[PDB]
């Protein structure tokens, strides 16, 4: 069924 | 010893169910939050220096997606996962009355109602002296969070016992239909 979502950790500039 | 740490926090705030959701994400170096995203705001922002240009990049790159996690993540989770679990959890408490110090001469003593292992934390405790609401003498600890998804709390009672007296610890909580009462006598 429904699953828990986790906020996306966005990468910084390389 | 040399050490370096970085953290990332993603927080979802809800008021009155989901009819008001706020989302905040923080990017932290050691203990310095440099960048941040807030629904109320709308775009990523620099909080300190390290985040000066980091902001400008995250918007160009993630802004859209991010602004969207407010649903795919916040609203979703709450409505889809929290209602059936967390917000449903209902742990009944445990009540027990204890005595400050071994037997009573007829001196100033204190009874310790002990409300334990409950959940959520909305609860009402109160003492009684022969059906009478003990207005004064009561004092309690600032509710404690056990960390295993349960709380506890102690409600003391400064009193002088006579004989034939009855002290009752009325305990009300959402998990219970009828309130638990626990009596105590100076036998």
């Amino acid at each position: 069924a429904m699953k828990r979502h986790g906020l996306d950790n966005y990468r910084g500039y390389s | 010893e040399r050490h370096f740490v970085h953290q990332f926090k993603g927080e979802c705030y809800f008021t009155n169910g989901t009819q008001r959701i706020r989302l905040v994400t923080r990017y932290i170096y050691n203990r310095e939050e440099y960048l941040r995203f807030d629904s109320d705001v709308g775009e990523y922002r620099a909080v300190t220096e390290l985040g000066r240009h980091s902001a400008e990049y995250y918007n160009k790159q993630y802004l859209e997606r991010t602004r969207a996690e407010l649903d795919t993540a916040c609203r979703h989770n709450y409505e889809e996962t929290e209602v059936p679990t967390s917000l449903r959890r209902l742990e009944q408490p445990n009540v027990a009355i204890s005595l400050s110090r071994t037997e009573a001469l007829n001196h100033h003593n204190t009874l310790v109602c002990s409300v334990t292992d409950f959940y959520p934390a909305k609860i009402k405790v109160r003492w009684f002296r022969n059906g009478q609401e003990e207005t004064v003498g009561v004092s309690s600890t600032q509710l404690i969070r056990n960390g295993d998804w349960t709380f506890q709390v102690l409600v003391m009672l400064e009193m002088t016992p006579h004989q034939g007296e009855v002290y009752t610890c009325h305990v009300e909580h959402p998990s219970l239909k009828s309130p638990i009462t626990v009596e105590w006598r100076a036998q």
């Binding site: 500039y13 | 889809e80 998804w149």
Partner: protein, 182 residues
Amino acid sequence: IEADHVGFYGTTVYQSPGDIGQYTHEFDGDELFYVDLDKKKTVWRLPEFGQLILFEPQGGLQNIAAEKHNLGILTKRSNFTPATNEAPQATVFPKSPVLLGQPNTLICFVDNIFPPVINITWLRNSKSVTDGVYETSFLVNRDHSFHKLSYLTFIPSDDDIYDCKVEHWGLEEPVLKHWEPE
């Protein structure tokens, strides 16, 4: 900030040397679960939990990854500026009332931890003990510090004495919270 409920979804932490990371989800302040980076799975706080609505463990590995990244980048950018240790503060108390012979759990609440690397251990009669011991993942504190909890399931004893041993780079010599039944 004000709100009726608050969920921490994806709270990720990484640090080096050591390449030590953490990914967890908390609701209304409690550890829903965490993610075991090795065995790579979803590990809850309570059994009764994910027995229906699960979480794709990969999703975490993906934030730890991002963080490893963001970590480096920032280290450099900050001019290899090191994090400052702190003095963890522990406190001990029982899950339920104290009754001899009656099971119960001893609890050590260590707050102000940071860096998120500490060593908590229990002690009965000045001797170390093992099992009946559970530990919560590091937990975030508003001021980006940490708190954790150690539970020692045991049984009261008229004699017996227990102590919560707390070690951290933030303490010259170990801290010891004592506790015993009146």
